[PDB]
Design a protein around this ligand. Structure first.
Ligand code: ADP
Ligand code: ADP
Ligand code: BEF
Ligand code: MG
Ligand code: MG
Lengths: 49, 361, 361
């Protein structure tokens, strides 16, 4: 999240921002598990939100 | 003289009144059986009555007449309901537990194991698990959140320095102790006197909180007092002995007619003793709440070191309204899964945020 | 004619004076029951007195008058509180241990089991498992860091060559012994007689360090002592065998009124005997410290063969200052993780770098 400062809008990085190797360009999220996600992180987000 | 002192009716129909040491002492006074028949009273009642100074060759003064019994007139003593005839219910007066001093552990206790009035639960752990420390924490929690209720703590067969630390740190609450130094007959005498007095207080429609220390080593104390076992229940239990723990334990109940009797106590488990396992199994089917405690979590110094999955309550609805019932239902459908150790650290982190209601909110 | 030594009141109402041989000697002097009453004396007190030689047909010297008791006049001895009501606290006076011969072992001890005056500690491991010479090391370190404390060592049920060896190698400090060759009765006599002298010695506000060899080998030797003592527990134990060992060990305590009584003893565990293991847990609920030693370490000749993970103190803050308690708080949050064998070598290296405080420095 600290390096997320260059990722301004929803997923796409802001124009005119310099990038180094190893820096996020587009933030894409897949599903945690193919058939069942991690119960740890699932229940994490369940009781936070 | 004001006589704060409870009937220890001896074998021959005369009685004794122990002192603030909560054990047989000097200020015992004879309680004749004629007064027992006259007043229709039960032993252990708070009796005040005129006493004459002892005379030559006369050892224990005779009670001339009870003026105020239980701070009440004799006729109330003559005509008052019998305890065993009272209707037991499920606990309906839940006990809220929010603590600033340890928000984490006590808030885990609350959100996981809610407590009601009349509750008969059992928290269990192996030896050297600070079960006494948890007793201290919950005692302070009750003294803070519910000061109205009478809090009483009984300690059996334990270290004296811990007793002193508790009594200094309990801030005047009724703390009864019987160290392992004391011979076991003293242990059982004190335990049963507390039992009868508490029965009287509940019989007077009170909210009586009894915090018993370590029912399992208390059971060993009984076995040390109780010779035969009859036939050896594996390793030396006893049927008729444990009945006194059984009577002392199952007496806790929610009474529909006012007042309540909630007693909570802890068990020693995983001691390599089949006896301890048998007592745990035997009272497990008796109590409506259980709070298991994993040793290796205490090894990790993580407090509370609860075995959460084994822990649970009966009649979750009867302490929690249908909206709270269903929200707890959802929360159990949620939390019934995630792994114990990580559960303990990351739940510690997540409940470190805010108040229990605030955390839920 | 001056008679000197420790008072051993015989059961027949008269007494004896035992000498440095630390057993039943013939240098005994009679203290009748009437003498006991009128001086209110206890056995074991450091007695210096005048006596007369035994008469015709009479075999043991008879006391004439008492002059010195525990290096004090008898008149003050009549006026002194007895041990039982003495207010105990938790240990408050720790002992720094960096010894030039083996600073590593003492450093591990300080980091894992800080030692304070009045501590009831323990070390647990099977037979032939790293105990006695470690006891030697800690005794020697105490002989330098706290020369003021009267340090006493008791050996029960061990090989005479070890007895002699530690005898010269302790540098004259108080070493008591009772080999397994000896009958159990001598074991009991010596053990309880040391117990009671230590009771009186701490009774004078003294700090007493008791280095008991083999607490659970003492337990096994007591089972051999145990003629019946009650009903068969699991593993072959009976009911009341423990009480004399329990009254023996639980006497360890930190007293508010000055002095201390710190007893460290070595426990044998994992012997494949239900008896031995059950004694391990039941005395585990008695001590304020245990030091585990696993055998995979020692079969590798890894020393000190300490199971670091299982070891831990009670109430660090009560013995260790808030800054010190906080720094060990952080450190235990740090040192809890690393895995046993790799833990052994990396922690050994880390403490081999510099001294404990120097490591913090
Ligand atoms: N929740 C806790 N908070 C603080 N200390 C604890 C806790 N649980 C266990 N301990 C530690 O465990 C040690 C021994 O357990 P203790 O609580 O005294 O025995 P019991 O098994 O009777 O509860 C105590 O010195 C205490 O420091
Ligand atoms: N600090 C140590 N380092 C290396 N070896 C030790 C240490 N302490 C004890 N030992 C060895 O371990 C053995 C255990 O001593 P002892 O307590 O008499 O045996 P046990 O308790 O197993 O019957 C001793 O013979 C000694 O040689
Ligand atoms: F005691 Be169980 F609920 F049958
Ligand atoms: Mg305890
Ligand atoms: Mg050895």
């Amino acid at each position: 999240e600290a390096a997320l400062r260059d990722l301004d809008e929803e997923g796409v990085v802001r124009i005119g921002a310099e990038v180094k190797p190893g820096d996020i360009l587009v933030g894409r999220t897949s599903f945690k598990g193919e058939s069942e996600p991690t119960p740890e992180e699932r229940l994490l987000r369940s009781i936070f939100g | 003289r004001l006589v704060k002192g409870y009937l220890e009716i001896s074998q021959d129909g005369y009685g004794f009144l122990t002192e603030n040491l909560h054990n047989l002492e000097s200020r015992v006074a004879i309680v004749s059986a004629g007064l027992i028949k006259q007043y229709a009273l039960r032993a252990g009642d708070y009796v005040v009555g005129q006493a004459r100074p002892p005379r030559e060759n006369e050892r224990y003064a005779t009670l001339l007449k009870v003026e105020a019994v239980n701070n009440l007139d004799p006729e109330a003593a003559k005509n008052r309901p019998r305890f065993d005839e009272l209707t037991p219910q499920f606990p309906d007066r839940q006990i809220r537990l929010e603590t600033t001093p340890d928000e984490l552990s006590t808030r885990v206790i609350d959100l996981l194991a809610p407590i009601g009035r009349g509750q008969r639960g059992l928290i269990v752990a192996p030896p050297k698990a600070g079960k006494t420390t948890l007793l201290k924490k919950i005692a302070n929690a009750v003294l803070k959140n519910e000061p109205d209720i009478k809090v009483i703590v009984l300690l059996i067969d334990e270290r004296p320095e811990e007793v002193t630390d508790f009594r200094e740190s309990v801030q005047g609450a009724e703390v009864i102790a019987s160290t392992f130094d004391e011979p076991p007959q003293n242990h059982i005498r004190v335990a049963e006197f507390v039992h009868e007095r508490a029965k009287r207080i509940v019989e007077e429609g009170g909210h009586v909180m009894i915090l018993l220390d370590s029912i399992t080593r208390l059971a060993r104390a009984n076995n040390l007092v109780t010779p035969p076992t009859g036939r050896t229940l594996s390793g030396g239990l006893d049927s008729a002995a444990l009945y006194f723990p059984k009577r002392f334990l199952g007496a806790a109940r929610n009474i529909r007619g006012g007042g309540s009797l909630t007693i909570l106590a802890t068990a020693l488990v995983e001691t390599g003793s089949r006896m301890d396992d048998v007592i745990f199994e035997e009272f497990k089917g008796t109590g409506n709440m259980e709070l298991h405690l994993s040793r290796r979590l205490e090894e990790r110094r993580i407090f509370p070191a609860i075995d959460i999955l084994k822990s649970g309550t009966r009649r979750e609805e009867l302490l929690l309204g249908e909206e709270v019932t269903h929200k707890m239902w959802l929360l159990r459908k949620v939390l019934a899964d995630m792994d114990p150790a990580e559960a303990m650290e990351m739940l510690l982190a997540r409940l470190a945020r805010t108040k229990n209601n605030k955390e839920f909110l």
